[PDB]
Design a protein around this ligand. Structure first.
Ligand SMILES: *[C@@H]1O[C@H](CO)[C@@H](O[C@@H]2O[C@H](CO)[C@@H](O)[C@H](O)[C@H]2NC(C)=O)[C@H](O)[C@H]1NC(C)=O
Ligand SMILES: *[C@@H]1O[C@H](CO)[C@@H](O[C@@H]2O[C@H](CO)[C@@H](O)[C@H](O)[C@H]2NC(C)=O)[C@H](O)[C@H]1NC(C)=O
Ligand SMILES: *[C@@H]1O[C@H](CO)[C@@H](O[C@@H]2O[C@H](CO)[C@@H](O)[C@H](O)[C@H]2NC(C)=O)[C@H](O)[C@H]1NC(C)=O
Ligand SMILES: *[C@@H]1O[C@H](CO)[C@@H](O[C@@H]2O[C@H](CO)[C@@H](O)[C@H](O)[C@H]2NC(C)=O)[C@H](O)[C@H]1NC(C)=O
Ligand SMILES: *[C@@H]1O[C@H](CO)[C@@H](O[C@@H]2O[C@H](CO)[C@@H](O)[C@H](O)[C@H]2NC(C)=O)[C@H](O)[C@H]1NC(C)=O
Ligand SMILES: *[C@@H]1O[C@H](CO)[C@@H](O[C@@H]2O[C@H](CO)[C@@H](O)[C@H](O)[C@H]2NC(C)=O)[C@H](O)[C@H]1NC(C)=O
Ligand SMILES: *[C@@H]1O[C@H](CO)[C@@H](O[C@@H]2O[C@H](CO)[C@@H](O)[C@H](O)[C@H]2NC(C)=O)[C@H](O)[C@H]1NC(C)=O
Ligand SMILES: *[C@@H]1O[C@H](CO)[C@@H](O)[C@H](O)[C@H]1NC(C)=O
Ligand SMILES: *[C@@H]1O[C@H](CO)[C@@H](O)[C@H](O)[C@H]1NC(C)=O
Ligand SMILES: *[C@@H]1O[C@H](CO)[C@@H](O)[C@H](O)[C@H]1NC(C)=O
Lengths: 421, 162, 196
């Protein structure tokens, strides 16, 4: 949408209201751990064919090592993302966080595989030995992974930064948000005066999460395209057995039945040359595809150390807006974050001035912006409109009133003067 | 015996990739199913020849009724005893179970970590009294080996006719 | 291990490459010297070409994994350059980027085909428990701390920094006033010392 907001050299727009927004973000961490056996696949339990494969050197020694290097790596990728806490913290038995509910994300003491109320939905929107192909099971089961997210999340609501910097310390949540507010340059007096309103916004934003995850038909597209690619690359591998590759018959068994060894060996080599070359294609595809997952498994590793275990000043990564934290959530083959950010709203305009003339000396603001509501001038913080009387407690003196342009005339009240009288 | 219902004309059954899934009896006309004998990867768990010569063989995804035998989600361990303790596991088997050399090879349910609980009251804070400086190393690979191969040297081998 | 594996993987992928020259690929002999003096040249190309298409295919493979493995190093070399630019030539506020704890500085050390850092961090220890309060009333006005936390040991309220004990008597310069204290939930009364 086209927009054009008016700009003036002595005009500033300071927001007067905030709006807490919770935005999800889905990343893939690991994929299926496949493994292929050549003799069962290429040969097919044929002793005559097994001797022919020896002529091709050691092509399948590496083809089992290549599919194993990207098999232990997947179990490694899950380690950095989740296993970043030495000790498994536990939720306190009494939930009194000053109005914040957290029941939508905390573990649920109910039917087994004790996941959260949101993790249950995420496990429903994403949801074998035939010849050589197998599927190895992951080292970290979904039950154990859910405990890792039930230790980071269950502790970050009580300590904050302290997990990444030694033994955990106790801070009430009603006071922890004051730390978060002060990070974005907003004084803590805003929080305590608006605890009830913020808690309602915090709970309402989380409530819309599972009501929007279920509303959209496909919200897990990032985590589903990974599964589709793996299934598509595995289905095509099996169909390669139904191709002759230049031989009389696609199936290797009947060739030995009706052909002499002097002639069968000539045409079996067509199958072995084709099938072996048809297997190295997927191995190279997997190696490139695995490198595209580790590039995202490392992005989520940092986004769990920086967004979760602390407040990140990086703009527009830990959610869009002024970032505070991010409650991590499990996923079948990935991680789902819940970034809690601030989006200012309800804007108002004022006329500004870089300095103030009082007794021939400039008065720049110590912390805040000079604004006026039309007649009188005030000092307000950057991200929230709170006017205060201009005194020496929030201004400093430097230079002379002849070097910087745009100064207005006003009197800075000295708080010490009325005390003497 | 074939679970599926067939017809008296089709003899051979195929599912995917020219696999003879079902085959019809030519005399009794009782159509059956053909499946090969169960397969399984033989994974050898060893603590190294330097320590000792002992092996806990694991067969991939087969119950312990068709092969101290222990049954796991990834298969069955034969040669290792399962103990109800839980340590930071040594040899990663899979499905939340590992092995270690300690009456030699023992299978665990690996522990995530030392469980801790902290009380958090709305009017309680904890501020440290002291600091502890520490130096933690970190190792990263920067460069590789600058290899180079003469392609003609390989395939031909100083042979003009080749 | 992160530096030993890269040396071993390249040395092993190269070692398993040379061993591929002793494979028949269907020819009578795996060595090209004897196949020349034993076969007549109209009959020679059909058997040599088997080695041509077999050795070339092997060479085409290991070149590909070198390209893939080089991406695993370049991606790990841009990260190393980031560590040198940020943690060594400055102080980084990123959490757990350069060590468990709060970062101070790093010392880079050389290594064969790699680099080793020495991250110096803080791990606060020996914590002691207290009762706290978000604000303090005084003459019908709230009092929020400029920098620190209101901390009491049972009798008197102090103001201490978030990572150490600097308990000073609460004064008008350690706190800032923000309206009447009727909306703050859980405020505890105390007398704010006037230093004037
Ligand atoms: C505050 O911001 C601007 C300052 O005037 C006002 O926006 C006007 O409407 C559009 C953009 O929203 C511009 O084309 C105009 O130039 C703006 N200025 C006008 C009409 O004078 C906006 O209305 C102001 N809002 C308040 C409450 O003061
Ligand atoms: C703007 O700030 C005010 C209060 O700081 C908010 O107004 C409240 O809105 C809710 C419902 O929307 C009401 O239940 C309250 O009674 C209102 N309070 C007052 C004093 O009127 C408002 O939510 C904020 N606007 C935005 C977009 O965040
Ligand atoms: C957190 O969630 C809701 C907020 O609406 C609170 O009330 C529950 O709402 C659900 C309906 O979705 C009911 O099925 C429950 O019976 C309600 N009670 C409980 C204990 O779940 C809920 O109380 C809040 N949790 C708290 C305050 O601990
Ligand atoms: C906005 O500027 C006006 C002055 O034009 C101020 O509002 C008046 O301030 C006097 C105090 O000197 C009061 O007695 C009046 O009741 C106010 N009138 C109105 C309509 O508000 C005021 O200083 C400024 N508004 C602030 C600081 O909120
Ligand atoms: C702001 O204040 C200064 C001084 O208080 C004003 O400077 C005066 O400007 C007029 C016209 O040039 C001179 O005749 C006076 O001599 C100046 N005052 C003094 C004490 O020398 C200045 O004009 C004021 N500017 C605005 C925008 O109000
Ligand atoms: C809490 O800390 C204060 C500061 O030390 C203690 O107050 C002092 O206690 C000593 C004796 O232990 C007295 O000599 C001082 O006169 C006290 N100073 C003030 C300003 O009161 C206080 O005793 C401590 N409370 C507890 C329970 O240990
Ligand atoms: C903290 O705030 C004030 C301290 O004066 C106390 O409330 C006032 O005093 C009496 C009771 O002490 C109340 O009936 C009045 O409503 C209050 N008056 C004013 C002007 O605020 C309050 O009791 C103190 N709280 C505690 C736990 O001691
Ligand atoms: C803004 O522009 C007007 C027009 O030139 C000028 O009078 C005024 O001094 C300027 N103020 C600042 C701060 O530049
Ligand atoms: C005292 O400190 C311990 C931990 O060091 C904590 O378990 C306990 O809750 C604290 N008691 C009070 C009243 O703060
Ligand atoms: C803290 O929680 C308890 C609930 O047992 C409550 O009685 C008390 O008033 C709360 N303290 C504050 C300052 O809200």
């Amino acid at each position: 949408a086209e927009n054009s907001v008016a700009y003036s050299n002595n005009s500033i727009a300071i927001p007067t209201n905030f709006t807490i927004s919770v935005t999800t973000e889905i990343l893939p961490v690991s994929m299926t751990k496949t493994s292929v056996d050549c003799t069962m696949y290429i040969c097919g339990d044929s002793t005559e064919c097994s001797n022919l494969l020896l002529q091709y050197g050691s092509f399948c020694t590496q083809l089992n090592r290549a599919l194993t290097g990207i098999a232990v790596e997947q179990d490694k990728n899950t380690q950095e993302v989740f296993a970043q806490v030495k000790q498994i913290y536990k939720t306190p038995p009494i939930k009194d966080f000053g109005g914040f509910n957290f029941s939508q994300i905390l573990p649920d003491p109910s039917k087994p595989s004790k996941r959260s109320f949101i993790e249950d939905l995420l496990f429903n929107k994403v949801t074998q030995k035939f010849n050589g192909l197998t599927v190895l099971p992951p080292l970290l089961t979904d039950e154990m992974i859910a405990q890792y997210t039930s230790a980071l999340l269950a502790g970050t609501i009580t300590s904050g930064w302290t997990f990444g910097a030694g033994a955990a310390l106790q801070i009430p949540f009603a006071m922890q948000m004051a730390y978060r507010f002060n990070g974005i340059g907003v004084t803590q007096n805003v929080l305590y005066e608006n605890q009830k309103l913020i808690a309602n916004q915090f709970n309402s934003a989380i409530g819309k999460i599972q009501d929007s995850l279920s509303s959209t038909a496909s919200a897990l597209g990032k985590l589903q395209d990974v599964v589709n690619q793996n299934a598509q690359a595995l289905n095509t591998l099996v169909k390669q057995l139904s191709s002759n590759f230049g031989a009389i018959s696609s199936v290797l068994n009947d060739i030995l039945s009706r052909l002499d060894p002097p002639e069968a060996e000539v045409q079996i080599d067509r199958l072995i040359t084709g099938r072996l070359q048809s297997l190295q294609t997927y191995v190279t595809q997997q190696l490139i595809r695995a490198a595209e997952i580790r590039a995202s498994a490392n992005l989520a590793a940092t986004k769990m150390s920086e967004c979760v275990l602390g407040q990140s000043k990086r703009v527009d990564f830990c959610g869009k807006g002024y970032h505070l934290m991010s409650f991590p959530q499990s996923a079948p083959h990935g991680v789902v974050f819940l970034h809690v950010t601030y989006v200012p709203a309800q804007e108002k305009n004022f006329t500004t001035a870089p300095a103030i003339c009082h007794d021939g000396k400039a008065h720049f603001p110590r912390e805040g912006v000079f604004v006026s509501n039309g007649t009188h001038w005030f000092v307000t913080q950057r991200n929230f409109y709170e006017p205060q009387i201009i005194t020496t407690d929030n201004t400093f003196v430097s230079g002379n009133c002849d070097v910087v342009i745009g100064i207005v005339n006003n009197t800075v009240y000295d708080p010490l003067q009325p005390e003497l009288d | 015996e074939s679970n599926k219902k067939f017809l008296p004309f089709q003899q051979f059954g195929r599912d995917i990739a020219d696999t003879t899934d079902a085959v019809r009896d030519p005399q009794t006309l009782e159509i059956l199913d053909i499946t090969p004998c169960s397969f399984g990867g033989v994974s050898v768990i060893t603590p190294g020849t330097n320590t000792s010569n002992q092996v806990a063989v694991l067969y991939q995804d087969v119950n312990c009724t068709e092969v101290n035998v222990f049954q796991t989600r990834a298969g069955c361990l034969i040669g290792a005893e399962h103990v109800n303790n839980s340590y930071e596991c040594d040899i990663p088997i899979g499905a939340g179970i590992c092995a270690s050399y300690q009456q030699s090879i023992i299978a665990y349910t690996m522990s995530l970590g030392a469980e801790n609980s902290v009380a958090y009251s709305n009017n309680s804070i904890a501020i440290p009294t002291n600091f502890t400086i520490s130096v933690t190393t970190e190792i990263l690979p920067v460069s590789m080996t600058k290899t180079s191969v003469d392609c003609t040297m390989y395939i031909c081998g100083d042979s003009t006719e080749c």
